[PDB]
A and B are shown apart, each in its own frame.
Chain A
Amino acid sequence: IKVRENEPFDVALRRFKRSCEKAGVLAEVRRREFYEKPTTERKRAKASAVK
């Protein structure tokens, strides 16, 4: 995620990092993998997404 904004106005623009990469992708890989836990615990979200 590259950010180079012309005209100095010190505005972080942390939207990119917090739009996909950064946390969420790291916290997801922090501990062990998943194996069987993903095919469920993750798909157990659709049981919620439905309603």
Chain B
Amino acid sequence: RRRVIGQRKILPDPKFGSELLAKFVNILMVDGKKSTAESIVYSALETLAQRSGKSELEAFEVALENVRPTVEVKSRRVGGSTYQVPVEVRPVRRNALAMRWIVEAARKRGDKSMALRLANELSDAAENKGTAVKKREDVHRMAEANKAFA
């Protein structure tokens, strides 16, 4: 409402030291248990490259290259009319959503162990498959469909 600094700076990944990566290992973190989380992020990120054969980051990156949206609608209560005016998503935000989606979607894959679950979704995402990309499309589907206001 008033406050305006920039963004709470985070500590890089403990293995590759990547901001984007780091925050991703946070969204997955539960009950403030950064330890267990880390193991999961790696126990899956490692398995990805184990197959993709590419660097954990360029591999992970791809997974986002799909789930990553670009435009979303923003409700604006005007004269009792709940309009859904669409708008492009800033870069810093864009990646966040992709990361949040991937996890939440992976957490529902009801596989065996979350560690492996994360891996699958991360793989499927790299080619528009899992629920990750699913939601992503819906987002853009909402927008444009409301391009009239756009």
A and B, direct touch (CB closer than 8 Å): no
Using CB atoms and an 8 Å cutoff, list the residues of chain B in contact with chain A. Answer: none
